[PDB]
Amino acid sequence: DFPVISPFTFPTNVRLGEQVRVFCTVRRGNPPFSFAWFKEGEKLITGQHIEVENTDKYTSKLGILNVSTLDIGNYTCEITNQDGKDSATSRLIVE
């Protein structure tokens, strides 16, 4: 079965300095999965103000603390298992 991400969206009224957490979760498909987050095209990993964390076998969290205008942009989660891949995106707008 080909894996499929449940669409995600950032909150709609994000202001400077808030924390933002979004979740990339698999609705169809069997683990184990790889989860990868990208901002535009660069791979994101835990560090600075960012957290990228597997929450359960079906889910990856992206957390962004003390959000700034520099955090505005398109964020993509890619999930991959032995049977295929899927990708979901959403745009973070601040202030």
Author numbering: 1 to 95
What does the paper say about this structure?
Recently, a shortened Dscam (sDscam) gene family with tandemly arrayed 5′ cassettes in Chelicerata species has been identified, which encodes ∼50–100 isoforms. Chelicerata sDscams could be classified into two subfamilies, sDscamα and sDscamβ, containing one and two variable Ig domains, respectively.
We also determined the crystal structures of sDscam Ig1 from another chelicerate species Limulus polyphemus (isoforms α7 and β3v7) to provide insights into the conservation of sDscam trans recognition within Chelicerata. These crystal structures of Ig fragments were determined at 1.3–3.1 Å resolutions. The crystal structures of sDscam Ig1 from both M. martensii and L. polyphemus revealed a common assembly of antiparallel homodimer for both α and β subfamilies of sDscam. However, among the seven Ig1 structures reported here, the complementary electrostatic potential surface pattern (negative in one end, neutral in the middle, and positive in the other end) has been only observed in the three β isoforms, but not in any one of the four α isoforms. Structural analysis showed that B and E strands constituted the core of ABED face and dominated the trans homophilic interactions of sDscam Ig1. Electrostatic and shape complementarity had been observed in all Ig1 dimer interfaces.
